[PDB]
Amino acid sequence: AYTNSFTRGVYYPDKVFRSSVLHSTQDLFLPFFSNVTWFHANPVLPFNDGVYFASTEKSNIIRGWIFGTTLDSKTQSLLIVNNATNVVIKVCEFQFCNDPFLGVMESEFRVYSSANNCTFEYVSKNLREFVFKNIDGYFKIYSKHTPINLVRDLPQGFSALEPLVDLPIGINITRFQTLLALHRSAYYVGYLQPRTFLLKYNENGTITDAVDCALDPLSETKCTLKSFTVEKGIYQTSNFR
Amino acid sequence: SFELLHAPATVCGPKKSTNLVKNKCVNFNFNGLTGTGVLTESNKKFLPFQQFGRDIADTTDAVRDPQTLEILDITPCSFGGVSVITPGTNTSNQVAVL
Amino acid sequence: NQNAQALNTLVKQLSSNFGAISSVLNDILSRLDPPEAEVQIDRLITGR
Amino acid sequence: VQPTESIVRFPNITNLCPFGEVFNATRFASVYAWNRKRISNCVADYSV
């Protein structure tokens, strides 16, 4: 299956506050209007330079993730999961076993079977989306909650992706896995590339709109003028080689 | 036995802070952000978390202290030229300065 | 508009390293020995 | 005007890299079999 990611997947390049300047950045973003490879409720997916993960559900069935570089044995591997409550993060080099799909009443225990020289620990009608980046041994996560009414389609709209956490674990992730909670008796995936954007701000809060100034000629023209409004005339944007 | 790896440093010593001062020309250092200016409390709120606000011409003008989470304002320390007003050396020697 | 734009692109040029280690002086000042930091400071001074 | 004085300000002190179970520990090991407890992301108070 395939769908179109209209204007989703926008996070904050840094922690700076900007009142109303219409700022132009250059970083790794999800391109506007691209295919997402949406699934149903799940093989391994390559983690090239960062991914956009989104989920649409009405029940708490979607669960954490597993990352790594070989996904076979004896290597550094992220592992973020979640139980009924108190989200636990377990990020170490170990012999991760398999893909532990969760099995539901509250009786859910099939996670792992191996323990070795761990290095880190942590214990703590809706749309949830995440962005993962692996830069200089830092793992950054951005998250946002959005209430929805339709669940069979990706909604139209804009929302910034406020930063969640960061981890200093040096690792070179290349693939990852996802976890569900199938009972016993729909998640979106997209990749992101180096682009240039025109994030807005409103001096009373956060980003309200953005334009990807590499999509169509108006995007290039707006990006040149550094404004969202273009007056009648002819504008010289770039060069053709 | 300390060790140095390509992974970012994680175990590092503590940094001695100091009690901030307002309404004076000081040399500030907030988690690397340095410079000088008069410190003043802000009338603006960043977010549930933001470190330092900038503006057009990418100048740092608003930061929050990482002990009380209060946003402060940075204004450049006073500078300007001095001018000498004279009626002429032959006329007199009184001088007014601007 | 022209005067403001020129005066704005003037002060925006202060965040360019001109091939040196960094744009800020107070970091190249307190992260290198003076004798070689002279080269970086000069290379930044010329650009400014 | 000139800067009255220089000020530095940093966040609160987090987990203090527990050394009490390494120095003030009860029972140590023998030489031919020595421990290798490794510290991790925290603040080390070498002044004490």
Ligand SMILES: *[C@@H]1O[C@H](CO)[C@@H](O)[C@H](O)[C@H]1NC(C)=O
């Ligand atoms: C997604 O890929 C298919 C072919 O695999 C293509 O027909 C479709 O136009 C693509 N979607 C977008 C939004 O370009």
Ligand SMILES: *[C@@H]1O[C@H](CO)[C@@H](O)[C@H](O)[C@H]1NC(C)=O
């Ligand atoms: C804008 O700020 C005003 C106060 O300055 C506040 O009442 C209002 O809720 C803000 N708008 C938002 C948060 O959308």
Ligand SMILES: *[C@@H]1O[C@H](CO)[C@@H](O)[C@H](O)[C@H]1NC(C)=O
């Ligand atoms: C300036 O001084 C000279 C000699 O000191 C004098 O002759 C002349 O009248 C003076 N002129 C004025 C305007 O004071």
